Design a protein around this nucleic acid. Sequence first.
DNA 1: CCGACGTCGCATAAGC
DNA 2: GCTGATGCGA
DNA 3: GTCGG
Length: 327
Amino acid sequence: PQETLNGGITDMLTELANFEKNVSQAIHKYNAYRKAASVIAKYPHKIKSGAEAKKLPGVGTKIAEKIDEFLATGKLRKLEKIRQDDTSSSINFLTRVSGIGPSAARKFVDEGIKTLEDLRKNEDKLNHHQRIGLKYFGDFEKRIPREEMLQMQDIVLNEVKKVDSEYIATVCGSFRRGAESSGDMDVLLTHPSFTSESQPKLLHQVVEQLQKVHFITDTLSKGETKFMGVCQLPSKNDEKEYPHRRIDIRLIPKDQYYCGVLYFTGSDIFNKNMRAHALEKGFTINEYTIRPLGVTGVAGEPLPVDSEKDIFDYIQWKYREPKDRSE
DNA sequence: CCGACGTCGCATAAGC
DNA sequence: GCTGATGCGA
DNA sequence: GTCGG
Ligand code: NA
Ligand code: NA
């Protein structure tokens, strides 16, 4: 399917989704509209009516109604109205700043703070995260070409090995599935000395080395197991600077690493199907472990996992490359 | 009819 | 001061 | 908002 097939409907639903999350603060309506937009974006026909669309799982009576009015008039009275509402459109916009959620955006607009300009004049009202999000507003909304991701991966793997050659690092997400672009970099980290039944400095030393070679530029959050921050590729001589990128790094126990790598490689539709096929076979898979059920649903101890393939073996599936993990 | 809708690490607030 | 709740992102 | 027990 292509854009001009049902793009008007999906953009409409996505827009409605954002106002639910950011303004009405109804996260489940937000996910409902998104789910509806997703199943429509994949539907290989130009939708003629709300009734036709209601067949798809995720599209109910109200969205069917809203599709009918769009097809007949080319717009939605409610969407048009909230679009021009100065208060609501500002709350919705401010949430595009990383660190500014629905609650913060509401507070800012409550006291006349509506724009990036307003945010820039009111730095003392921003926490550390929001300042970084403000500083890199444009960059954070840019996607990352795979070639740059490869160059980013090169640096991460190199410095990680340089700190301790026994570290194991894996860049997951859509990148590992071979996507041509990425929204951010998701790095999963482990070490043989770190298990579940067992230094608290393993993550810090890696972050430290990446900051020191000036790859990591900023820190959003950082604990003993999870790092969230900003990075940037070195500028190729005289040429234009690279955009600042979002990078996450997590330290996972060795015995939970490949369950983690599997989960955060995705896709989410693939994960869903996989942990659906697994209950069938008497196993429960989460992001950490795989456990056996249990003649009455009582989960047993986590099974030993030493690779992604090990998980597939447990539930009698053949190993499927990250490339072929869209569903 | 009515509850589910993912879950959790980290920063920060909020109350004690 | 310490702790649980909340906000946020993923 | 949608699904389903
Ligand atoms: Na439906
Ligand atoms: Na935000």
